[PDB]
Design a protein around this ligand. Sequence first.
Ligand SMILES: [Zn+2]
Ligand SMILES: [Zn+2]
Lengths: 22, 16, 180, 151
Amino acid sequence: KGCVVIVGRIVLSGKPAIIPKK
Amino acid sequence: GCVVIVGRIVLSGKPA
Amino acid sequence: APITAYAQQTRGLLGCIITSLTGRDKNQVEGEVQIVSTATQTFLATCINGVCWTVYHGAGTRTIASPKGPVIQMYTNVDQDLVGWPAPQGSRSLTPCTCGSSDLYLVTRHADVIPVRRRGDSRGSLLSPRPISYLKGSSGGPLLCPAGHAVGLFRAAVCTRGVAKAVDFIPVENLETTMR
Amino acid sequence: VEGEVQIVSTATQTFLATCINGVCWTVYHGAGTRTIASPKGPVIQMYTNVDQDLVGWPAPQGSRSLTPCTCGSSDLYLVTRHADVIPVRRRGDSRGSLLSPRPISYLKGSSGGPLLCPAGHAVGLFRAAVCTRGVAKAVDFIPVENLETTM
Ligand SMILES: [Zn+2]
Ligand SMILES: [Zn+2]
C-alpha cells in the first residue's frame, strides 16, 4: 500500500567545475 | 594590497 | 578520478504524499543514486546495470511511482534484504566492481563519500567513526571501490554508544544471485 | 551552489585558495600578508605561516569546506585553476609525482589548490611544481596536517 517515491538524487558523475556567473 | 576572489570551483560539478 | 557527489531535492513532503498515493510521478530523473521515500521513511536506491536496487527493509514490497503509474518490482529477496525495480528513464547506472579492492567508499544520503575498509564479504570499518545520525537514511546507497564501481549497498550500521564504527552491506554478488 | 576552491588574484598574479575546516587556505608566496576582500571591507588573515608557505582567512562568501583525508591513500588528484584533475602518486609527506608530466604552464595559477584522495578529501595544498626543462613531472604540497596544526 502506497508507492515508494523519488524525493531527490545524488550524482556521482559530476566532475570538478568552475561555477558560472548567473 | 588585497586578495580578491575572481571565481569558484565546485568539486562535485554540481550545477546551479 | 576522485569520488565526489552532490544531492538535489526534487520534491517535498506534500508532493511526496500525493505522488505516493497517485503512483504517478512525472519529474525528470538524473543520477546514479535516487533519494527515495515512503510515508514512513527515506532511504537510497542505487542503479546498477539497469536495475534500481534498494533495501527491502525500506521499500518493502511496494511499487515505485513512475511517470506511467506505479511500477512493480523486478526482484524481491526478503532474506537478502533486496528489491529492484527497472531503473527509471533518465538515471545512470553504476557497474559491479571487477578489481576486488578492499578500500571502499560509502556515499551517504547527504552526498558525502566516506572511506570504509573491507573487513569481510559483507562488512567494512569506518576509518573515521561517526555518530549514527550521519548515516541516517543511507540504506540502499552505494559502497564504491576506488574506480567508482559498485561493491555493495549499505544495509545497516554497526554502532555502539551511538557511534557507528562499521557497516554491514549487501555485496553486489547477492544482487546477481537475487536475479538468478 | 557553494565551492570549496576559490580562484583568487592579486595585482601581481592569480592562484587558488582551498576552504578546509572553515578556513580559506592558500600559499604565502601568493598572498603574503595580504588581507582578503569582503563586501564589508578587507578581512585579515586568521593564520600566517611563512615557514610552511601557508596562510588562511575565514572561509568567504559562497564557499563550502572540504574534508581532510583519513584513509591515507597515495593516489592523489590535483585540481587546477581550470578545473582539470591530475593524478599524482604520493612519494612522501610533501611530494608526489604526476602520473603523466605536464608543461609547466598547465599547472600555472593552481598553487593553493587541493590534492584530493580517492574519496575527494584533502590530502594537502598544492605548493609548487617540480620541473625539469619546462616539464612539471612532480609537485610539492602542504599536508592538511600542517593546516590542522596551524589551527
Ligand atoms: Zn573496482
Ligand atoms: Zn582519503
